[PDB]
Structure 1
């Protein structure tokens, strides 16, 4: 049932139904996305690739949320050279629910 696909400059081994967090997409809050970048599909018989991507495989997903992650603190500190720096960071994400491993 499971399938592999490349999204936010990186790949996810996803099953049908389960939610997946991934890097922010230019999509609305409750629209839909099609990944034709599918790298692998597994079942009884595995449809692996001798080329880039499969052939007629498309992962259809529905966008759930559009949040920001946990705040990461960034402390740059140079011992004895009168230098330190502080910086927050909340990375943006997009939860997608998978609704079709073709």
Structure 2
């Protein structure tokens, strides 16, 4: 089966037993996240939304907490004008292993 849902910031296309990347949530380190926020569920055949959020659908998915993502070098430079600066960022992310698609 498969479904689509909305996390923080954006949506994702998800099947069961898949593992997908998510935002730093307040959920415990191994704990399960619950999406009632889901846009379609399909058994290989569709039961979509009318208005946003399907009536029965829920997606239960365990987390792995992770930490800080890969470094990026942000480079500000103007030519012939004596200005330059560098800045870094890691971000923070989590992954989730999917046990949901329940209705």
Normalising by the smaller structure, the TM-score range is over 0.9
> Distance between the aligned counterparts of 2:34 and 2:101, measured in 1?
10
State the secondary structure of the residue aligned to 1:47: strand
Q: Is the 8 A contact 2:2 2:44 kept in 1?
A: no
> How far did 1:30 drift?
1.0
Structure with higher strand content: 2
State the secondary structure of the residue aligned to 2:98: strand
Report matched runs for 1:4-43 at 5 Å.
4-43=4-43
List, as ranges, runs of 4+ consecutive aligned residues in structure 1 with deviation greater than 4 Å: none
> Distance between the aligned counterparts of 2:16 and 2:59, measured in 1?
9
Aligned length: 102
Unaligned runs of 5+ in 2: none
> Distance between the aligned counterparts of 1:14 and 1:67, measured in 2?
23
> Distance between the aligned counterparts of 1:38 and 1:45, measured in 2?
16
Normalised by the length of structure 2, the TM-score is 0.92
State the secondary structure of the residue aligned to 2:68: coil
> How far did 1:12 drift?
0.7
> How far did 1:9 drift?
1.4
Aligned CA RMSD, in angstroms, stands at: 1.0
> How far did 1:29 drift?
0.8
> How far did 1:56 drift?
1.2
Unaligned runs of 5+ in 1: none
Normalised by the length of structure 1, the TM-score is 0.93
> How far did 1:74 drift?
0.1
> How far did 1:88 drift?
0.6
> How far did 1:84 drift?
0.7
